[PDB]
Amino acid sequence: AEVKGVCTEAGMYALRERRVHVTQEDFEMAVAKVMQKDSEKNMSIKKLWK
Amino acid sequence: RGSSAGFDRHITIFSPEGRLYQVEYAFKAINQGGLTSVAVRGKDCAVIVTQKKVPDKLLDSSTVTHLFKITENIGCVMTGMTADSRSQVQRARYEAANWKYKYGYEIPVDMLCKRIADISQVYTQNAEMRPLGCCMILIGIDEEQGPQVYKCDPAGYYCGFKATAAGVKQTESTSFLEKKVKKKFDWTFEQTVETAITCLSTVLSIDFKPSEIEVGVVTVENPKFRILTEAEIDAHLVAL
Amino acid sequence: GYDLSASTFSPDGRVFQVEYAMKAVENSSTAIGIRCKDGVVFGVEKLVLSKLYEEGSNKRLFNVDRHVGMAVAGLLADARSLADIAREEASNFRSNFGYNIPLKHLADRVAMYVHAYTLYSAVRPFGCSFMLGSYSVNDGAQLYMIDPSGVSYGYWGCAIGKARQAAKTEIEKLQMKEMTCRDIVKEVAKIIYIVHDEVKDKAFELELSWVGELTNGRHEIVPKDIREEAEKYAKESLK
Amino acid sequence: RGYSFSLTTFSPSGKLVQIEYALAAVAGGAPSVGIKAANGVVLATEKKQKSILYDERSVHKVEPITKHIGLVYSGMGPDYRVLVHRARKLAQQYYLVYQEPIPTAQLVQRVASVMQEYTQSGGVRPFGVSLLICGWNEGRPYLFQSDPSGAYFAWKATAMGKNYVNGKTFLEKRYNEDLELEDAIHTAILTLKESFEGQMTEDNIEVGICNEAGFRRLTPTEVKDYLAA
Amino acid sequence: SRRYDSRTTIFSPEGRLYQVEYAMEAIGHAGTCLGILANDGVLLAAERRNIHKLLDEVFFSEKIYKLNEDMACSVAGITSDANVLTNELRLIAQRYLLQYQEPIPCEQLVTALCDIKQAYTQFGGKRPFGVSLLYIGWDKHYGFQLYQSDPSGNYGGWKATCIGNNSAAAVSMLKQDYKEGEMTLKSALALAIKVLNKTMDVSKLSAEKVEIATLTRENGKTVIRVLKQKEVEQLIKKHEEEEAKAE
Amino acid sequence: DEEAVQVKEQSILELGSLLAKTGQAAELGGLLKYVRPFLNSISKAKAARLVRSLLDLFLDMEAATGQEVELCLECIEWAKSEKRTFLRQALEARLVSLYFDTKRYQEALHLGSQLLRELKKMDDKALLVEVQLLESKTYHALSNLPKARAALTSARTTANAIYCPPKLQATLD
Amino acid sequence: SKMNLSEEVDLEDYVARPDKISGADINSICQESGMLAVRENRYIVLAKDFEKAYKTVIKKDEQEHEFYK
Amino acid sequence: LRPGRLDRKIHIDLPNEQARLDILKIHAGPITKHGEIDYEAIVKLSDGFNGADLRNVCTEAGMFAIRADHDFVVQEDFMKAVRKVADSKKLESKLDYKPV
To answer: Contact partners of A by the rule of 3+ C-beta pairs under 8 A?
Structure first.
């Protein structure tokens, strides 16, 4: 699901850039955001367990 | 967070979350008396003040108290269960006497508090017995350390303080005193006796009379612990 | 399951077994102690379970030393064991420090002995409350009390037993400060009769005692004639 | 009399559960750190009192055992006091028999062996503390850890207590075997800082060192100077 | 108090000691241990679990223990109970030596320790020791030896064994590839490297996630050694080369 | 003479502060060359404080006296000799900043990139965003718009996982 | 921004505090501050008013007995 | 409990000594009384009570007064009332809950 989300996120960022194409820089930023939110969810679950 | 595994709430053993519930409840019993005390450290004087509740006119008011002398120089307040308080006071007196017998000089406050807290730690490790439900505060003059104010609790914590409160109203009094110590110095004269009385009066909202509190003092000029009488207490009460 | 041993606190910071033991002490009859200028006066209501017992069966006043008295209420086995322990403390004190035990010190030692029975699982709290009272030229008249929790507090007047509240409301009126044992005795009988309930219990015979300047500092059973006159005055007051 | 039966017992999965809970308590305490420099060994913990009314000098967490070996903890306080006392006693017994300062490896072994006894003995519960010991024996630094289970581990650099996993990641990033004492103590001060929740005043942290000169706590003025950087 | 008693020393309704069963269940997760008795040596091959870049190197070993001049043992289970048992074993050896001025034979020793353990699981109310032992030694009665112990107190001489994680698999190959009486020390070490490489499925022998011991007789006296890094890695390179040529 | 040493270090610190306030750059440099043998009379940690504070005070002003490059090179060499590393890293970062101020574009890159490598090897974040921002500014000076933008984006990312002081936030924006 | 908020108040102090506070609370602090102001019959807000507001809205959880840590 | 819906969380705890005196005075007003009535004594025997308990002290005081078949409340009936209602309190479980 993470690797499915990174695709849609990167496409949408490229769209905000106002282009027809996604870029490697855009993909990097999307994957950073998606993985950051994934780790945030994991640590939130851990805190809830705490 | 609040799991239970077996007898973790019946004997002093760890809970799944690394918690000793019996020690926690014991702390909860310190408030079963319904009393509070405060201690304040001055520049050349250390003071301990406490409530004194005469439930009715059949008790002998001279006997009900919570101030005791461990030595001639070190005096303490006891708060919480009364029988446990007496037991701990007896153990303290014996320990101080033994210190002077063995080592040839009177016992430092901090070291007495350490011995007593160690006793309580043994009480909170072994499971045959239960932790005592009382807390101490000690005061006296050190030779080269100035006035000392120290307290101990059921779990075994013996932190030394600049101004302290123990009892039902621990948090309100501690807040007030923290603010004062923030202001200039947390009282810097023998009229630190007024700050403690004010703290108790504000927290409990009482407007004390002469016959509803008992004080003890230690001065650098007069190291011997002294238990303020009713006339002196009334004088200080009028002062404010 | 928080009330099976004295080695466990309730979640709200209570030792229940002690509370139950102290509850037991409110099923036994009423005892009274009043301190005055001259000395102390104990008076106990002794219920007669059956007509077949002797007079003086299960006396509920004891002598722990030649100057000290002891009133009890609750389990009698615990009362007698604690009487033994107080006697032992007094004898040891005399043999060690060479003089009659000051009463406060005896109260402290006995109370510590009781309190030590309210910490462990291996033993159970005593089911008895008791009051010590002595008199000496130096220390004057004293009257103390120790409850199952092991708390010792001095008293100007107290009542340990079933009808403790009624007596307490009654003892508060004497102004005992400014009388002597001789009138305190009549008062004590008066109260013990005012508190007694004739609907529930059948009948009783008083046990009275004192220690004061009239005994040279000896605790001893109040003499027969004075006891009878006191009983008669109490009877009249209960018109 | 006293209970004569063990209170830690094996579970169906073969795990001594009470030890696990003691470890939980340790993981829920204050942070701690220790590094082994090439020419010294540094310990450092956090001593954030609860109000302005606590005397920072009233008690200390970094405590010595002899002139050349000392220890700090993270966990419960009273247990740490007991273990400090036992360690000092065992050190003095070793000195009395052998007339030589006790080596750190042996003192750790002995204190740990004392820690095992309470996992199996009757009517007792495990210590809720982990210690780190530092020594300078045989011209050589030593850093050990000891946990409630009675197990010890030699460490090149470690960090235990609350948020200890992230601390161990940090230290894994910042270890360099050729490190020097001042840099090591600086790196430690940082690691505590990685999670602290406030400003690290001179009166909210402790440190202790060991070298040829001897294990010795750092005075607060020294601490402020080092914290300068 | 009977309320809190655990009854760690009482029979179950089918005559099986449960605390013992759980104790043996703990061992099946600690490091694997291997025994191989050669015709000219004995060898212990356990796995180094303390695999972190921030641990320090200390002592001559981490799982192998000397007990006499002529005896050594390796442990699987709890580390602390391991230390307690090792100390008692050392004491037993020295007590025999003091009484007889002869090194303690190997079954002398193993049965003394197991007797302590058994007694411990018979009466007392404690938890049993969660440790299983492997030993190695030489004595003038039976030569090179390889014993094993369990939380129950039972032991056994093994020409090849495995106590600990993946014990079934290791003993399965050890049955498939053991030449009874036809093994040199070198061949036994190679067999150990192979079996362990199987068992430590996590990666391959890193020459650092392993411990090896050898007990030999040299110049009339026993010599105990723990293989260094260079020789271990060389052995592993030889093993991979042999397997490659084989394929 | 420990009290004398404390008095002397306090006096030098105060005098350096006063000179930096007055802008006596030549006097500041002479003073810095004066305390050079002082290393053997002060703690390594407080020698570090003193040298770093004095260098910052001198560099706070933009007086192009010309000793900035040589002073920084000498200070970095002293740090290397003293095995300071972290302070050595801060000094190198500031030196590359100065090299940027002193219209030196190509050369300052290689040392800056070496800093980025050494520092990725470790994981300092504030310094890393700083050096990445400076490298982006250098690429903007050389007009390498695409690489400059890439560096700026990387620095932005690095800043996201860390709280930014106000100065740093302003410079980033 | 809609306050009278004398220049004395330094909000950086209140924001700095390591206290996990939700946006709705951040509006009760600013509201209770003016509330106290009106109680004392002012139309300005002093540092003390704000301090009391923040101590009112953010009551800190029951301090774990310090024999942990 | 969010501070946009329930802005103020007012605590209303058990009366303190002076407050106890106030409530006792407020409830004991309309009674028909004889002799001195030292509310300090009741305030001292009424630890842990609440407003209802002191109202009940007054009600029970009058109940006792009628039980004697007088036409007034004297001090001793107040003392009996306070001690009684102190006896009944052993059933209530004293503890408080906070919004956390």
So the answer is: F
Domains and CATH numbers, chain D: 1-229 (3.60.20.10)
Please give the Cα distance from G29 to G43 (Å, whole number): 16
E2 and chain C: CB distance < 8 Å anywhere? no
Q: Are strands E42-46 and E64-68 parallel, antiparallel or unpaired?
A: unpaired
Structure tokens at G16: 């700095």
Query: How far C53 CA lies from chain B's nearest CA (Å)?
Result: 36
* CATH class of the domain defined by C1-237: alpha beta
For chain F, the maximum distance between any two Cα atoms, rounded to a whole number of angstroms, is: 60
The count of structural domains within chain B is 1
CA angle F152, F153, F154 (to 5 degrees): 90
- Kindly list the domain boundaries of chain E, sorted by start residue: 1-247
Say if strands E42-46 and E34-37 run parallel, antiparallel, or are unpaired: antiparallel
Decide: E and A in contact? Rule: 3+ Cβ pairs under 8 Å. no
Distance separating alpha carbons of residues D65 and D92, to the nearest angstrom: 9
Cα gap B107→B96, rounded to integer Å: 6
Cβ atoms of residues E32 and E164 within 8 Å: yes
Signed CA dihedral, B94, B95, B97, B101: sign only? positive
G-chain residues near H4 (CB < 8 A): 24, 27-28
Distance of CA C41 to the CA centre of its chain: 10
Residue H5 marked in a binding site: yes
Q: Please provide the DSSP assignment of B4-37 as one string.
A: --SSTTTSS---TTS--HHHHHHHHHGGGS--EE
CB contact under 8 A, B87 and C112: yes
DSSP-derived letter for residue F37 is G
**Hey, is E136 helix, strand or coil?**
strand
Q: H8 among the known binding-site residues?
A: no
Chain C (1-20) residues lying within 8 Å, Cβ to Cβ, of chain E: 4-5
Sequence ranges of the domains in chain C: 1-237
Structural resolution in Å:
2.9
CA pair distance D185, F44, nearest whole angstrom: 12
- For chain E, first and last CA: distance in Å? 66
Residues of H within 8 A of G25 (CB-CB) are 3
Can you point out the beta strands (E) in D122-187? Answer: 129-137, 140-146, 152-154, 157-160
Domain that holds residue B49: 1-240
User: At residue D151, what is the residue type?
Assistant: A
- What element of type H or E holds E217? strand E211-218
CB E58 within 8 A of CB D154: yes
Q: CATH for E1-247, among 3.40.30.120, 3.60.20.10, 2.60.40.1120, 2.40.30.10?
A: 3.60.20.10
